[PDB]
Amino acid sequence: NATEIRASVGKMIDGIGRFYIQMCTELKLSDYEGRLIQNSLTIERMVLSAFDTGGPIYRRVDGKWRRELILYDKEEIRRIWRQANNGDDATAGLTHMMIWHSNLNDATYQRTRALVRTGMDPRMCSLMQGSTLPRRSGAAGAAVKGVGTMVMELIRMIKRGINRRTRIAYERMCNILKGKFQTAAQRTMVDQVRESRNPGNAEFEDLIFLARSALILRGSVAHKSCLPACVYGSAVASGYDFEREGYSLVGIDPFRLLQNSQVYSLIRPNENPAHKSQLVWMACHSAAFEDLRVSSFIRGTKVVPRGKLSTRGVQIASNENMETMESSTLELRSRYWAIRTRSGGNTSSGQISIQPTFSVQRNLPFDRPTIMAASDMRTEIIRLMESARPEDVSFQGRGVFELSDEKATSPIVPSFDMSNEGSYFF
């Protein structure tokens, strides 16, 4: 059903576009100045703030870039927003930029200070997908969250409490949690946790376990390709009428859109442009915890690790100066594309006999034992954990698609026998 899903999300994309265009028309920015991921960001945040203000706005004068510090009627912003969405709220829309920010933050920064202070191992990076993502995020906003993300929450919710309506949260927060797991025990052990009203260190210690189980027996976490407002604004302005032509966040749509985007970015004096583009590109698909090998494969070019990356962050701090500041054109094109997945990969009182109702060749079942016959769920997992090898192939048969292959017709299988450059962005 490509009607609602493909076109309703198109309508949410149109809103962001239209709005970005309106908002650019207010600031009286130029074309080059509306394509500046910097300014786009500021605008996006102005809005999410107002629906839950001012910001840094960079201008282009003969030669050099001028930063303007401006403020807007928090309500005016809310007004212009609905105007674009037909006077609707389009929470989806705000939530969308709510993620674009997330996915950018999960790649620009490493959130160790918080994991440890929670009592999670800093090496649990690949499980903190969407830790920055405000709770206000929607229902399809949390689905993007990593297993580890959920744990940091409950643990704090629990840690301060164990140190009214708050209950329905906890159970649900676990149900979601549990819905991340895709194996018997995993699933069952989550329940054993959700049993305690005042879950103390008993739970505190157990979920942390399950956190680590996901490092091996991963869960289902959705990835959403959420591009900057400018990209959608520019697209809308170019005629693309997504609600009519359909759009996706996990298909070929987002890559294709980025195949023509003209996004520019402010770049500090000693920073590497190629390195800058990489960053943004990884935020456009939630590839901050992906295997660098595959990221580079699909990317088309080296996807260098965070440490070796030359850049501190895309936003410009009030500290810096404009004199020594210039801007480059971000390389967001990719070689192939791939279905952004959700899956993490993987490798009595009852009846005892069957009463036959039809005449067919059928082995008739009965439980030989029970008839003639007259522990720690951790263990289960630890035992599963074990048989697991890092070489264990996932998404068997799934491949990569050419950018011409609009339909999911012909898949391509990558062979990594190659002089790679690592697998852990962090």
Numbering used by the authors: 21 to 72, 92 to 202, 213 to 396, 402 to 428, 438 to 489
Reproduce passages from the article:
The native ribonucleoprotein (RNP) particles are formed by the association of these single-stranded RNAs to multiple monomers of nucleoprotein (NP) and a single copy of the polymerase, a heterotrimer composed by the PB1, PB2 and PA subunits. To better understand how these processes take place we have determined the three-dimensional structure of a model ribonucleoprotein particle that only contains 248 nucleotides of virus RNA but is biologically active in vitro and in vivo.
The three-dimensional reconstruction obtained by imposing 9-fold symmetry lacked information about the polymerase complex but could achieve better resolution for the NP ring. We also carried out a docking of the atomic structure of the NP in the cryo-EM reconstruction. A good fit is observed between the two domains described in the atomic structure and the volume of the NP monomer. The interaction among NP monomers is conserved in the NP docking presented here, with the only need to alter the angle between NP monomers from about 120° in the crystal to 40° in the RNP volume. This interaction interface would be more realistic, as no NP trimeric structure has been described in natural virus RNPs, and would imply a small change in the arrangement of the connections between the loop and the body of the NP (positions 428–438 and 396–402). The model obtained is compatible with the interaction mode proposed earlier and further indicated that additional side-by-side interactions are now possible due to the tighter packing of the monomers (black arrow).
